[PDB]
Amino acid sequence: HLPPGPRPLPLLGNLLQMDRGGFLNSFRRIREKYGDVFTVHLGPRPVVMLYGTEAIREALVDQAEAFSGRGTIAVVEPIFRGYGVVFANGERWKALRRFSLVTMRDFGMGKRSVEERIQEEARCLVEEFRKSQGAPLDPTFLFQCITANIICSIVFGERFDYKDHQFLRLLYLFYQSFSLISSFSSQVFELFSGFLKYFPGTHRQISRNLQEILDYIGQSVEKHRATLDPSHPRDFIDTYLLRMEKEKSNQHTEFDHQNLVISVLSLFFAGTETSSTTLRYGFLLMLKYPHVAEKVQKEIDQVIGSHRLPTLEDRTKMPYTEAVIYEIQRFSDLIPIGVPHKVTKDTLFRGYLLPKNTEVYPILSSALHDPQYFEQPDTFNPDHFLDANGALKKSEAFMPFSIGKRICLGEGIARNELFLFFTTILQNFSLSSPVAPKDIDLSPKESGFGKVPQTYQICFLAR
Numbered sequence: 244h245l246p247p248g249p250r251p252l253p254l255l256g257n258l259l260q261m262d263r264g265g266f267l268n269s270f271r272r273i274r275e276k277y278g279d280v281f282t283v284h285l286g287p288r289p290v291v292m293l294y295g296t297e298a299i300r301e302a303l304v305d306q307a308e309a310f311s312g313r314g315t316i317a318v319v320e321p322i323f324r325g326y327g328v329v330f331a332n333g334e335r336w337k338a339l340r341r342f343s344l345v346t347m348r349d350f351g352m353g354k355r356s357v358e359e360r361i362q363e364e365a366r367c368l369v370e371e372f373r374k375s376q377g378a379p380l381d382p383t384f385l386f387q388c389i390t391a392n393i394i395c396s397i398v399f400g401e402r403f404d405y406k407d408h409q410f411l412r413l414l415y416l417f418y419q420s421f422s423l424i425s426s427f428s429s430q431v432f433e434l435f436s437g438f439l440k441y442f443p444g445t446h447r448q449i450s451r452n453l454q455e456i457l458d459y460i461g462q463s464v465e466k467h468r469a470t471l472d473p474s475h476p477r478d479f480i481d482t483y484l485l486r487m488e489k490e491k492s493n494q495h496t497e498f499d500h501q502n503l504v505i506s507v508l509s510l511f512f513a514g515t516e517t518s519s520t521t522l523r524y525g526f527l528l529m530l531k532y533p534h535v536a537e538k539v540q541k542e543i544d545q546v547i548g549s550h551r552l553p554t555l556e557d558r559t560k561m562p563y564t565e566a567v568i569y570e571i572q573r574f575s576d577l578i579p580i581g582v583p584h585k586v587t588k589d590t591l592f593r594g595y596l597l598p599k600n601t602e603v604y605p606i607l608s609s610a611l612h613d614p615q616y617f618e619q620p621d622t623f624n625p626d627h628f629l630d631a632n633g634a635l636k637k638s639e640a641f642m643p644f645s646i647g648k649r650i651c652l653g654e655g656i657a658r659n660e661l662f663l664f665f666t667t668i669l670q671n672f673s674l675s676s677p678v679a680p681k682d683i684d685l686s687p688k689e690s691g692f693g694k695v696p697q698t699y700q701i702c703f704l705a706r
């Protein structure tokens with residue numbers, strides 16, 4: 244009944260079958276041979292694998308409700324412990340997500356605005372960037388400090404100075420925590436947590452960092468409830484917290500302490516590594532195609548220019564910018580395996596039958612590179628999102644944020660985040676790196692199922 248695949252080893256499953264090349268080309272091969280949606284047994288864990296725009300969509304969109312449930316990710320779970328909105332299933336999920344959305348958009352007025360807030364951080368990014376002035380520098384950390392700062396602003400209410408002792412001792416972790424989750428002993432744990440639960444090692448060390456972050460969060464929440472002003476709701480914490488008051492009249496409501504605290508935690512968990520990486524890779528790309536950055540730099544001017552602040556109402560009158568912004572995302576393909584779904588009920592897909600909770604990885608990477616929707620699917624080439632008359636050409640296969648009932652909660656936030664950060668830099672300061680444009684290597688340093696670009700250095704020559 245389950246979709247077809249490679250016969251597993253009875254204990255490891257196919258984890259041996261992977262190593263052969265990349266742990267994703269391994270998948271490529273195990274398409275027909277086996278087709279477009281197959282199963283693989285990771286460890287002892289049966290996993291369906293939607294592969295390729297059409298197959299992904301058909302399931303995740305046209306059967307969206309069935310496929311909308313969140314899969315197991317056992318390593319970081321012992322903490323997230325099934326709360327908050329990445330990681331909830333059930334009504335809890337359909338309700339926290341409902342909250343979280345209403346609470347942006349109607350985050351404006353005020354103040355501030357997510358927009359104003361990103362610009363505020365941008366002013367700062369530029370400001371901090373000007374200081375080096377020709378002097379080359381790995382901007383992989385200020386990209387992590389600017390991405391992370393935004394989330395702070397939203398959840399905590401204010402942005403930290405980069406130099407800040409808490410912020411730093413918090414940014415590390417996050418990124419180390421990330422680093423650890425993406426290590427061999429984590430991957431093993433992910434699959435055999437049942438066994439390795441009981442013995443020490445990086446799965447604990449991971450949870451201890453996250454625990455720390457929580458005690459900060461929970462701490463900040465008191466401070467928030469003390470200072471709490473029902474009239475001026477400072478941020479997410481506040482707004483939740485006041486909504487929480489509202490629910491005092493319900494014997495059994497769903498907005499309890501730990502859905503707040505862990506959500507806050509999750510927001511960070513989502514809103515940092517990825518959106519920073521995409522910027523790193525963004526600038527790195529701009530370097531290898533120094534003219535694409537030029538073509539944008541001219542467009543930057545025509546529509547904005549010398550003085551004012553770059554505004555969201557720009558991208559609409561700037562196709563290339565956004566086109567580029569898309570190709571940066573398509574190409575860099577930063578979540579390649581998507582984040583685990585599982586089906587809510589037994590479910591009928593393409594004739595096969597997946598029992599309740601059968602896990603399913605939407606292999607989007609297969610969609611950002613889908614040969615059916617793009618041509619030189621493997622090269623960086625913005626004309627992937629242009630047409631002949633060089634206006635935007637959106638594509639049903641571009642889904643870096645996933646697709647359907649689950650699509651990335653902070654998609655908007657990031658979509659904007661990229662745009663401004665990208666334009667507000669490229670407004671001020673022209674990329675120039677020691678590394679020769681001829682052969683910049685877009686190879687990632689490593690994957691750990693999370694490519695990060697080979698570490699790099701460029702200068703920022705102003706105006």
Ligand code: HEM
Pocket residue numbers: 313328329330340394509510513514515517518521577578581582583584643644645646649650651652653654656657
């Ligand atoms: C370009 C950078 C980003 C990418 C590529 C990205 C991508 C994704 C993807 C692919 C998913 C999986 C949806 C699924 O399969 O269930 C997701 C989920 C999620 N992401 Fe993002 N994301 C980005 C930035 C952010 C930011 C900035 C935030 C916070 C502001 C965020 C918050 C979330 C949340 C809360 C979920 C859980 C959705 C749910 O199941 O309710 N992400 N993201």
Ligand SMILES: Clc1ccc(-c2cnc[nH]2)cc1
Pocket residue numbers: 258261262263264265266430431
């Ligand atoms: Cl090249 C390669 C390396 C490691 C794995 C792996 C991770 N977890 C189990 N096996 C697979 C393929």
Ligand SMILES: Clc1ccc(-c2cnc[nH]2)cc1
Pocket residue numbers: 316329512513514517582651
């Ligand atoms: Cl385990 C996990 C889940 C979701 C994300 C994410 C969503 N949006 C951006 N990053 C990252 C890591």
Ligand SMILES: Clc1ccc(-c2cnc[nH]2)cc1
Pocket residue numbers: 316433578580581582583692693
């Ligand atoms: Cl099985 C599995 C799937 C996805 C991840 C991931 C994606 N982004 C960060 N971590 C980790 C482990």
